[PDB]
Design a protein around this ligand. Sequence first.
Ligand SMILES: CCCCCCCCCCCCCCCCCC(=O)OC[C@H](COP(=O)(O)OCCN)OC(=O)CCCCCCCCCCCCCCCCC
Ligand SMILES: CCCCCCCCCCCC(=O)OC[C@H](COP(=O)(O)OCC[N+](C)(C)C)OC(=O)CCCCCCCCCCC
Ligand SMILES: CCCCCCCCCCCC(=O)OC[C@H](COP(=O)(O)OCC[N+](C)(C)C)OC(=O)CCCCCCCCCCC
Lengths: 155, 149, 55, 183, 78, 105, 80, 353
Amino acid sequence: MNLEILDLSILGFYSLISSNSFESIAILVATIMPVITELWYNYSQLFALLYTLIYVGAVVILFVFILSVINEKESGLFILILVLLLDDLDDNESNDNDYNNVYITDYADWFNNYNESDLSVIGNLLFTEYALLLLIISFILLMSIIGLILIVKKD
Amino acid sequence: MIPFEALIPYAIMFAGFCLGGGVMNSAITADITKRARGPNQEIKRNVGEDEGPRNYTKPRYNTDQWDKYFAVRDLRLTGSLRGQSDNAVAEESFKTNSIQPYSNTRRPWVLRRHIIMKNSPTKWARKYSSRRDEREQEIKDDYIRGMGE
Amino acid sequence: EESSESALSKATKWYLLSEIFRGLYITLEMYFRAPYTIYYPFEKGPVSPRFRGEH
Amino acid sequence: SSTHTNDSLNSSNYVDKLKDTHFVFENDKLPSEIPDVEEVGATTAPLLSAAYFIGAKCQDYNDDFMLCQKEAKGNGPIDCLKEGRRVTRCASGVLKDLNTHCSDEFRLHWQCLSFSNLEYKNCRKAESLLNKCVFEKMNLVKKIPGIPEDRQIHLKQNPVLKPVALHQDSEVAFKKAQNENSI
Amino acid sequence: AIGDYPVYYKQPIRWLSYHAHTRPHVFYAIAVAALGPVFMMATPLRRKFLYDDHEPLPANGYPLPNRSRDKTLTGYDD
Amino acid sequence: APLQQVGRHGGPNKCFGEFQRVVECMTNAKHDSYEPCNNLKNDYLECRKHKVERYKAFLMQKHAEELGKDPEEIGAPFVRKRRFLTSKTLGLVDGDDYEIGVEKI
Amino acid sequence: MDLILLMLVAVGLNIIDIYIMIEILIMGCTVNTIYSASLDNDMIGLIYSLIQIIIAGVESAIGLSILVNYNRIRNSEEIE
Amino acid sequence: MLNNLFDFIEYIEYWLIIVAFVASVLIVVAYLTVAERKTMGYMQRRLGPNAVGYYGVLMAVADALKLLSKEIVLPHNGDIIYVMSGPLISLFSVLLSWAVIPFGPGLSLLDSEYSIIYLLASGSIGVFGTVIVGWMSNSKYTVLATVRTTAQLISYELVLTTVVFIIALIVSSLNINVIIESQYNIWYIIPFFPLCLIFFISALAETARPPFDNVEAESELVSGHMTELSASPFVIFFLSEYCSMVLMSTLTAIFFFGGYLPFSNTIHHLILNLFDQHSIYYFIIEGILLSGYLAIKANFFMFSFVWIRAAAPRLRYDLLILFCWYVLLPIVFAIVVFAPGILYCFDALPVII
Ligand SMILES: CCCCCCCCCCCCCCCCCC(=O)OC[C@H](COP(=O)(O)OCCN)OC(=O)CCCCCCCCCCCCCCCCC
Ligand SMILES: CCCCCCCCCCCC(=O)OC[C@H](COP(=O)(O)OCC[N+](C)(C)C)OC(=O)CCCCCCCCCCC
Ligand SMILES: CCCCCCCCCCCC(=O)OC[C@H](COP(=O)(O)OCC[N+](C)(C)C)OC(=O)CCCCCCCCCCC
């Protein structure tokens, strides 16, 4: 019972009916959590935690920070369920049937006696191979610090 | 003048940590050891008369990918993920029980069911345009078209 | 330029929270003193012959 | 490193449910054209205990087994099947020797490894006894290539990092050898 | 100048004193931070006086002997 | 030239060998055109997605359906729950069928 | 279903709701990259994903800064 | 029966361990509240709670049961979503953050090389839980403590995150167990004493404890966000603040005082030599000892949470945000460029053994 479907159906139900900005910020948190949880299992535990640390901890609480600043002011059940059911029918993102119905494996090998985490390799390449990508990023971060202050600061 | 009535809560908080730690250290060690005694329940529970002193196995931490290969390799030899054995020759069942897991490689559910995340210029072409799939289907067809030579 | 303390002395007190650690220490002295509390209704505070109460 | 893969056991049964993992067996044995070998039956701890003695005894075959992989040019599994049996037989030879010469010295050491998170730093007292026994009865020695003899880690008299908890059988066996041998 | 703000290119020594009294939150954060790269520069001094660098780790796979396969290798045969 | 297809341990991964053989052919100097490297390009794509091999699995599934071959007797035995990789299934001599411990290693 | 542009019904009627849709849209790109990289056992795809998460954060901060100053510009009497 | 009941236990054993784990944390949290008043009582020459259960042992029981049996005040009868959701996020995050803390070598529910990230990520979910409490309310006092609450937690999160990363840089591992074992020869309070003061200062702000108390300041904003909370939403949110106190006191023990490592290896060795390693009685004693060392180290910091509250007046908010940015952050970045320099100079760059 792949319950990850039911979490998004609830999420897809409330995205069609949200009115104020409180619910709009709720759709953000209600979308990262399935993204984090479906990354924790299956694909990548490292990027599930990076998402929590960087999205939830950094960019999500900034939204609610400015919503309290901006303002707080101010459909039919048949059409919604009809739309959600129609949205529910066709969920095959790709049309390679064999690629979606046939399973595969990999073979492990013992040639790698220096076993270290992925974040070890990513740092190994980001700080050596693609040190230009890393250095431009600190340059993009630098422009934001200047960019934020020029936009917002009054005097 | 040390107040003992003030330190009563701390002696209870000290017992709180000790209660949790004492259970975890002993229960996990006992379970790991017991399952590392043999391949059936009538061996794990009983202790033989001619068996010597019991050597407990402590829980393992800070593992890597070799410990996931070592664990399955130990499973195929003793029936436990942390079994013990030092026979120079394995059983003849060792050559016919390799476990190779087969799993699908489909995109996450959120990537293909979210009301917003699934909308994109290229994700529609994957989902509603046959241009890509007809081109690739040619290569699959020509696999069986070349068995005649 | 007329501060008697050197720069390092003023910064060692500032970075190492000189007066705060003292402030904690004085509070911890009280922890090893006899408290004042009396266990009413098993004990009573002092009364004097001039006290005004019920008529 | 506990990264999920498609090649072995994953962290939790919730990974298996998402991937729909099937743990598939293959009953078919190897064809008779490939002569059989007796696979090594040792588990993780005994192998890590005898690893440096397999390196000392099977060094030529291990190097030759690998050199076959280097020069097979991608067809390594198929073109090194005969050279891969010498290594299996050689390693089985060492574990069979330790069982028939140093059974108690060997078992004491890998019981220590199974007791101390499979770390060599925690089992030096048992390991020193095993190395001394193996040398006299099989002439094998433990050597770590790439450093001077005087600076090998397992010979360090006062290590910086020491086990937190002692192995009782190691400490008891050690002091007995302080009487049996240090005459 | 009993209390004037020093000019850095005329009074280098007094300029740091002004900042070591009025801005301890800046002067010693810079002083601590510069002690890292300074210590990196003194690495060659340690090599010639204290001890050499350790041997690099064997983290490149199995060490393959640089030779040709042995031809007389026997034993452990079928 | 930049490294592509780096494994999770810093070394070449499964499909790096195929990609490297493509680069050798494309950047080679003895080739007049890119025709000789066309097969190597397919292998690199094949190594990554197995699309042709998954297709071959589809026919063998479909051909057995039209012949009536029993799936349980042509396919390979499998176990879906990791707790039931019991010593009876693994083939151990005196193995029970009681579940195995996959709680904590 | 989405070919009738259903996602327009799912985006709220405030400027802040557009900003969120941009993040949820980009979130799909990063999840797609993490998916491919792990299957291929390729860390270069994981370098890309790390950059996408960091770059998608800088985009949010600038957008909110513009929105914040947009808001105070109306409420700029300040003659009290 | 005796054979069809043993396997029942073996099928339920790992649920009894978790319950013993959850009970272990809750007992500390429950009796932390008493110890706070009992300690702060004796520093004020009071006595603190000593009338509810013999010597006040049942004080957390009475306070929890009193509030669990109060009338929940909802804005409208069916508004249980608004009141509970705030505290529920806060409680789950700090209860899930306990999953990486080891009570001995390997005795943690979650063991992975990304434990430090998991610990910082879990805490930042709790921050989101805190600001939500007021942001669904029209009460002026409750909605006051969101913009100031948001920045205070935001600002001192950078300082707490960076300090954890400096310790992780010295061992080159983001695993909790590896950090503890790396402190065998030395405790990181000796080389990194300033980081411990910075860690403890930051820890106070993140839990909103005094002197960084401006969120729930009784004289300033009454109960803060809790001036609209009553009955269960009050307890769950109150419990979260004390789960964090126990956690952040344990984290200071792990990062700077060696975690579960003994104060004396000799006393540890002498005590354990009185038990046989071939019987389960040895492992209970070691687990009690190893958690005992952590408990004593952790207790000293739960003591210091209360101790600083009884000795320092509350710090003004405007001067509080400028403290972490203009003082703490430059120092924390100064060290993060200092520690790699010293390690490289002496060829001592760390590796996970
Ligand atoms: C541990 C559980 C924590 C969540 C407890 C609340 C669960 C209730 C269901 C909401 C969460 C479902 C996820 C989709 C978001 C939907 C948000 C929404 O539309 O409003 C819900 C809430 C109640 O209002 P409602 O009557 O449902 O809608 C009309 C109101 N004018 O409107 C409100 O804003 C009231 C306050 C709710 C604040 C919730 C904050 C967003 C949720 C974040 C926590 C959960 C994260 C998502 C996990 C599930 C993901 C599917
Ligand atoms: C050692 C580890 C524990 C202490 C850690 C913190 C150290 C603080 C002092 C350094 C900062 C500083 O500025 O120190 C110097 C200051 C101030 O000196 P002054 O006013 O110029 O002295 C006047 C002139 N004399 C020098 C002639 C006297 O001295 C202090 O206030 C000392 C405070 C001691 C009590 C607090 C310690 C106990 C706390 C709890 C321990 C369990
Ligand atoms: C190089 C060595 C690194 C050492 C790192 C340690 C630094 C710590 C902070 C020092 C700076 C400071 O206390 O600053 C004081 C700041 C801001 O003061 P300000 O606005 O600048 O005014 C004063 C300075 N003037 C006049 C020069 C401009 O506010 C405070 O009162 C913060 C007090 C926090 C106390 C919290 C309780 C402590 C709990 C831990 C012990 C139980």
